[PDB]
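Homework-ish question, so no full write-ups if that breaks the rules, but can someone show me the predicted structure for this set?
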Amino acid sequence: GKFGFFDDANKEYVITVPRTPYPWINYLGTENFFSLISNTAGGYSFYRDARLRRITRYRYNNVPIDMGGRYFYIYDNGDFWSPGWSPVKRELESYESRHGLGYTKIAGKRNGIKAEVTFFVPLNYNGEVQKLILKNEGQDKKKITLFSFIEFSLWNAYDDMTNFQRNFSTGEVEIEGSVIYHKTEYRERRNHYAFYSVNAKISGFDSDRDSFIGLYNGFDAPQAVVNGKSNNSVADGWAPIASHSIEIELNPGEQKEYVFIIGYVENKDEEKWESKGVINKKKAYEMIEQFNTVEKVDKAFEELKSYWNALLSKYFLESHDEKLNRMVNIWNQYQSMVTFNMSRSASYFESGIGRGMGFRDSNQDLLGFVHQIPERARERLLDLAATQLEDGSAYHQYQPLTKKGNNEIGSNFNDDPLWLILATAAYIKETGDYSILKEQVPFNNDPSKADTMFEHLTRSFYHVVNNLGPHGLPLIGRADWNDCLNLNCFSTVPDESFQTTTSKDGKVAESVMIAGMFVFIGKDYVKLSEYMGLEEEARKAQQHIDAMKEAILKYGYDGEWFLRAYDDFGRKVGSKENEEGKIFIESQGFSVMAEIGLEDGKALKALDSVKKYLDTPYGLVLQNPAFTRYYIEYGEISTYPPGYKENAGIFSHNNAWIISAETVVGRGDMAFDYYRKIAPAYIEDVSDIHKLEPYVYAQMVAGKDAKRHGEAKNSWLTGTAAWNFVAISQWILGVKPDYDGLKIDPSIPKAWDGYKVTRYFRGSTYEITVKNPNHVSKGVAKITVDGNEISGNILPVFNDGKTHKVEVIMG
Amino acid sequence: GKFGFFDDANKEYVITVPRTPYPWINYLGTENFFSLISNTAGGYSFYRDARLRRITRYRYNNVPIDMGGRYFYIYDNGDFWSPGWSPVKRELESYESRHGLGYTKIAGKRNGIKAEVTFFVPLNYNGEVQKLILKNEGQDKKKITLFSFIEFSLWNAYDDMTNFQRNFSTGEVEIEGSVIYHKTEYRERRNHYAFYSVNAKISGFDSDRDSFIGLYNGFDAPQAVVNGKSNNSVADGWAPIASHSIEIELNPGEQKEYVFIIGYVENKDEEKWESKGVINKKKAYEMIEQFNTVEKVDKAFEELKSYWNALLSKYFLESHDEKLNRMVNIWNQYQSMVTFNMSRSASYFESGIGRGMGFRDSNQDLLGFVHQIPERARERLLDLAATQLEDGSAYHQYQPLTKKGNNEIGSNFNDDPLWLILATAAYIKETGDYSILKEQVPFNNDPSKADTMFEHLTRSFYHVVNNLGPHGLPLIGRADWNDCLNLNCFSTVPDESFQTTTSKDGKVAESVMIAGMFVFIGKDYVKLSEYMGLEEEARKAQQHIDAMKEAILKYGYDGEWFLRAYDDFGRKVGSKENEEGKIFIESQGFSVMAEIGLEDGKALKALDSVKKYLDTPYGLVLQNPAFTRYYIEYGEISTYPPGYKENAGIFSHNNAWIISAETVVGRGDMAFDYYRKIAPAYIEDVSDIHKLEPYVYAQMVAGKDAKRHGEAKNSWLTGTAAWNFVAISQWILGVKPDYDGLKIDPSIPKAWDGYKVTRYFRGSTYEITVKNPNHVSKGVAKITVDGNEISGNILPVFNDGKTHKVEVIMG
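A: Not a homework solution, just the prediction itself:
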């Protein structure tokens, strides 16, 4: 089942039918103004905050789905339709949608009239620009009417959808020329407003929803569009909208162009009013003048294309697999950048009312986008470290808008501090900029408590050391990376949070996953300690790492796989002795990546067990068997039906760790098979089963215990893109940043003959051609740089702005 | 503009067209199970808590409006329609709706097939019963299919509408026989579930929304109904629904009857499962068996009718005005009882996410419903007093479910304590039960700090005494009765509450309206103090009352009307020297009711000024002139556009106080004109302007400064019903409870010849016939009880369960 195809030359996904299994969306905007747009032009826009600065209204889980957005109505002699096929849903002669990099194109034809709309947010612009082209492809002269419609939001989304008893009397608009300004609460405390404008003379307008649509009518047939005439209504409370109407006369073969702008303006309090009750429109006038011709719009479109091309140019792959090429070169990096820009705020599954993203998620995304925006990565790392508490713990939720931690949610997720060390090590390996270690960083956003970045890393490292359990393993606390494994909750009451409610003291339950992560990250911590000249501190850290490794080998191995945890009773979690959940996935990847059990066959046994018990054609499930009842001692994980979410669902986020672990043991075929089972481009042929966007990763896919096995949920906003890109580009393809430079260590399927990677690293360009004449999976026989043989597998650092040819021969 | 009529014999409002200016709703349920149902069968149900126990999903501010509810689809040979005309919106041969007392009837006919559905909640039943009658009124044999449909909610409205990450993977149902059980999260921590059942064999079912309706289809054309066949889908996450389908063959003149039940079941934790994964259904079986025949449904319907008739029988009026009779005998008392049952939880303007009602709101509602349910009023008074703090202050928000105050919202609304004294005095005057004063009542819900009820009243009285301002007037605090008059806020940043954020110490701003309330209620406080044998305390209280009266006369009168307040700068609010807001309405009614200025003409001057400046054909506005800009020193009141809400809107709640004040000065014509301008039955002829329900009061009507002058907002849930009933039944008609018994003191229009009131008072029935041979407005010339002339205007108390004839001659 296919609903479109990939256009690699244009870097687009082309949707050919409007009835996709689910509405497939795209993101517009780079810095402050952001838009979500579906393939039928549904969605909404906001300014830096989907919770507090929502511009347009969107209804989630609506009947019918995805109703509301930038709606264009073509009215022709009684008939009317929409180029996106929605909301009118009248059959079109042709329909097409294209999701590109920061822009969306929607084309529709009916009765010989074709409408093409391009939506995008220009760089350094607080608005969404929509270029509309109307073409008469018939043989007769035509007289039509064009309607443009958006529905405004009342800024505060929660108040917009709950507080009608006040906000039904606050909606205010202004209409001037071809611009409709939304200025609700501008009269009292808001210095900002929105506007909807078109660059042509209009025949009519509408600003009241009830007048344009009708109380008992839907979006599919507004009364004004049915009548073919605007009502010129002025909104007074209730629901403000913005609708233009233009009467257009088209000769056969003639076309017309229009530019619509959804803009946001912030005024200063001293220049708020042109006169009494009249808002100041100078900034809006400048914004409208900026894009009043098609040529300016095209120039901005080319600038956005160049910006996005520059963002993706630092890692380029040339191989025999076009699906792999399109994943690595375009869509994975695009998703990583979009995730950085959007955090976890708004999607079609995130309602946009959240207050921030996870601290560990913010640290993990950096691993994915560090090679594209190193300076912003450095700034984000410093901002994340500034929120750390004095004891080394971290706030669970980070708020990028205010750069502060969430005090209500709290702390005591005992895996959070190590992600900061991992992200800092990744940044240093990418850039070589050790100076970030000497930066003075406040603790808990307090300048008086400021210390170095390395002090933050040291406190993060020793938070685990000072919080060990009876077996010598780290105390899990409220939760580890798995937020649904709550071993201290013991909840019996509904509406009680599994993550912030604890009934146990948290002094017994341990985590093997945190132990593996500690061993994996302590290597980087010891290296950074050695760089700073602290040899004794490095020795003590190594001693603690060795102790944790011995603890894992003694109490963390079940016999054929690594144990998952210990509960508050001291009982094993993830053991063959358990009735359900005999094996988990989280404790195998980090244990093998930490090189535990490599010489005695324990890692190989664990990976074989993972293959035997967790493998499905759609990926690897979280644990097996699934929990068939509620377990009070485990928390939220057992509250799901089997095969869904953390109850034996498929998270490709932790599939990436298994991929890396398979590369560690030298099995590149298994690693690539696991990568292929979850990569979007390889599953586009089963889109109807996947049901979600075939060009980006989703958070969860229903597992083998579910009836909807293979169906995805929570797409477009997850840390999966970063980890999967790291696994494919560094662990399988073997181009790994390292403290001394670029390391080459591929772990590939042995049937491959070779490939090429062009990598921008530390101010230079490396063109690395990997060849596999003897058809091995791992091991480098020879490396030649600029025609000269080198020693080892670390490429020299040039920093000269040139291109250097590297030849790698496996063997 | 009329959209229906009144049926006084059946105590109903009959809506004859489905397209009312707004959806008009009714409430079902008395104790625990509650339902909101519109005239097209839209709405939803819940169990005691619209926030935490919502059973069915409803979307507010939807396009089209009022989509979702108990939807019945009649499918006939390809055609399909709905008896409520919604959501199909196909033209019907006939449509009718009837809103009664606790029940709603909807009848619709198409193609010779008639469907009549009665919705009601039986007494002592945790479910909504819908009786459906299908009649073939054509001349041909017919074969049709009947579809039922409801959409389930996931028990938590906020989580249901914001948390999709989770909730899209939790929906679970069971299907057994003709019953569909909704059991989301029953497997982990919920001991309750819902069900939808029909008392006949079904031909098919549907429980998944995407299978019954389709992803891109709306409620107006579900795909299963379009195909005329059920899909037998089993819900697995996403959106659970419930739908039966029955194939029915009807001969000409033949009719069939069905009973549908939306039920709620709570199981014990020890008895939750019939077997592994199978819920226990014994309670559901008993509930379904209770109403499996039409005869049982009819018996329960008659029982509900008898219950509602008994509730309304304690005050009966016989006059020449049928509109007045219908307002007083049926609809005002019905609204008072519904307001008591529902608090301020759920309406079509209240989203149902609130956590309680106002403390003063409950105290004021008690004045309205005390004569119908004295014992429940006593219990509510004790519960309200139990939340009072030790210093005499009260929590602003009361939560009737937990009987606790809202700590987050807080206190410092300095008018709240006096309402408790007023409500207690009203209860004692109604019942004569002084024993409530001797009850031991906790302070702040602490049994260790318990004292008498009279101690609570004393602390409430002395909270005002100990919080006076520089002029001797009470300090307003956060706000008085007007919650939008915030004189200590001075807010500049948006999204921060005007009511809970204060930038001022609150030691300057005073309130004249609180002073008037204090003088008005101190009379009852002094009477209660005299009853308890505390003469010195009564004398001290009288001294404080006299001091407040002198303070009002010296600093509270502007020259022709009473001042409103003083701000933090010490400047007059509601003064002729102000540019806007020269006069307010709140400070006149309570000042005149407190009998201030009766002898020097100040009260008459104030009432004449109110008539001159605040009077509109749709009622009296709050203040004049309206505020045309934001005033940082006044708070939220100036944040509204002119003529809306507290910015010069019409609140009939405070119109009732002006009505009572007009009765005080002996002008019954003005009082009745003011009452008529706002009474629903008198405005039913301008329904299109009113736009809201013509049978219940609304909170706000747009004032003369608004373009929508005469349009209502926030209907069905307000304290207006209680105060307006008190004003009409006690102040105008003159039947007033008092400490020694029933007092007769009418204040009526001079043209009236007389009337009759049958009043149930203190265990007896009084049949009072008032005659006005000399055509006066106020003053009683003679009172005769059982043929014997009495002295004074207080009727003797019999308490013998008999009827006594009273003749009142005015003069």
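Now go work out the reasoning yourself. Hint: DSSP finds 20 helices and 44 strands in chain A.
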